[PDB]
Ligand binder design. Structure first.
Ligand SMILES: Cc1cc2nc3c(=O)[nH]c(=O)nc-3n(C[C@H](O)[C@H](O)[C@H](O)COP(=O)(O)OP(=O)(O)OC[C@H]3O[C@@H](n4cnc5c(N)ncnc54)[C@H](O)[C@@H]3O)c2cc1C
Ligand SMILES: Cc1cc2nc3c(=O)[nH]c(=O)nc-3n(C[C@H](O)[C@H](O)[C@H](O)COP(=O)(O)OP(=O)(O)OC[C@H]3O[C@@H](n4cnc5c(N)ncnc54)[C@H](O)[C@@H]3O)c2cc1C
Lengths: 243, 243
């Protein structure tokens, strides 16, 4: 696995901390992997297997990537590492995985997620055509966490300010259910906390009934679960769904 | 009662002359629940020692941590309509309220709602509170056919749209439409709000047609031609006393 060096830190917003990774270990990293996922490896005391955490490549340059960390409640190893790490420190990473961008063969676009998906949504918005139409709906912890995102003028940005994730999964789904319905062939991309993902998925299956080719949904974390516990819930739900 | 500072977190052009602004954030904490169709006051600060100007708007929709307010993009901009067009996500505004909501009386066999675009938000909310088997009319005066909206409503509450590009100082359009509707049989409830002169014409008509108790007969002037809201408040208070 690759060893990258911390060469910068940027407080993007109060709860979003961006780490730049590069150095000699970056050599050979595949080009143009923005929005692809990587795995951060955290060594464990007394265990040869690392703990692993999934993050998005927010930006990529010739010899560097940026990774954006939500400074979430209830630190885990990854959010602790992001706050504590110092320039010059190194971290092993695996990946990148396959990019899962929104389908561009569509007349309108609906993107939604919470702050764990804001990096990927940011990248997707830069890949939409300039004449694109639709919505990007993002749940953030505070108004200060709103970002000035690049986006097509007619893809309307909507921010939902929710200081604590809702186990009932309402805030994003309630906002989107109360937006006008989009007409034409659409593409949907959403990722957020597990319960909000299910609520959005249910709502959007009912509103638009889109094929899987144009309907990406993913749970990125779950309240009360560290990432290992989350992967199980997620696989069970994606199977129960697909079946 | 110190005003709440809310952040603009979304904008949606509902129709060409109806612009919906979503407001929320930390200033929303504690906001009373279930206040759709209640009024709020927007504050526009003035130069120097001057107290701010205040404008009255309706809570169109309410969610966990935000409200939507629908602005008519009316002829002859005032501070509120100019503000709605120019404001950007991230901007803030102070609000007062909510006031007491005045929903149509539900103890009735039929329902008649009427108003112009300043009343379309409250009428929309009222239509969602009626029982599904409700019978009657909702008659709305809009500036153009494009300002007609696909409102949720009981199937047997019939929507009627009056298309009038400029308000009538004699107050004829809504009244002439409603005077020619079949008369409803049974115990009724009426709710109407529009430009002052049309309000007077409708109140007179429906007092004569149905002569309902005040418990079941709501009328309100929401604005007046040639008057800013301060000038309007005086006329409205004088007319409410005469009654
Ligand atoms: C494909 C993919 C891409 C992702 N990209 C990013 C990214 O770019 N940036 C990012 O910040 N996250 C991203 N995530 C989410 C990230 O993997 C999880 O948030 C992970 O749980 C964080 O690891 P951790 O060590 O801090 O917490 P863990 O040890 O996994 O969990 C500790 C505790 O924190 C809670 N918790 C975890 N995440 C959050 C959160 N966001 N809000 C509130 N509580 C939380 C857990 O429920 C648990 O209680 C991505 C997830 C996936 C599946
Ligand atoms: C209880 C209540 C609820 C209301 N809810 C809403 C609401 O949800 N949405 C909404 O748009 N309005 C609503 N109104 C009406 C709103 O208060 C007035 O339209 C207000 O005058 C607009 O403020 P302004 O600063 O733009 O104009 P002002 O500075 O008050 O007036 C400027 C000029 O514009 C004219 N004008 C004002 N409104 C209109 C109009 N609708 N059409 C044409 N000319 C107009 C005035 O006559 C004046 O010449 C409500 C009124 C009341 C009493």
């Amino acid at each position: 696995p690759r060893e990258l060096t911390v060469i910068g830190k940027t407080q993007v917003t109060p709860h979003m901390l961006r780490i730049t990774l590069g150095g000699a270990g970056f050599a050979g990293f595949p080009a143009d992997q923005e929005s692809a996922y990587i795995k951060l490896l955290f060594p464990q005391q007394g265990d040869e297997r690392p703990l692993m955490r999934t993050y998005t490549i927010r930006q990529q340059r010739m010899n560097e990537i940026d990774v954006d960390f939500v400074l979430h409640d209830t630190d885990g190893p990854a959010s602790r590492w992001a706050k504590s790490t110092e320039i010059g420190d190194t971290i092993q990473i695996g990946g990148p995985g396959l990019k899962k961008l929104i389908n561009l063969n569509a007349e309108w676009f609906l993107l939604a997620g919470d702050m764990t998906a804001l990096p990927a949504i940011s990248v997707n918005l830069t890949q939409l055509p300039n004449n694109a139409v639709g919505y990007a709906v993002i749940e953030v912890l505070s108004e200060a966490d709103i970002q000035p995102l690049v986006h097509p003028r007619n893809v309307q940005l909507h921010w939902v300010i929710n200081p604590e994730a809702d186990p009932e999964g309402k805030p994003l789904a309630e906002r989107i259910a109360q937006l006008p319905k989009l007409e034409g062939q659409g593409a949907v991309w959403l990722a957020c906390e597990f319960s909000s993902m299910r609520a959005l998925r249910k709502l959007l299956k009912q509103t638009y009934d889109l094929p899987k080719s144009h309907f990406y949904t993913s749970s990125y974390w779950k309240i009360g679960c560290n990432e290992g516990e989350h992967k199980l819930v997620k696989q069970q739900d994606e199977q129960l769904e697909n079946n």
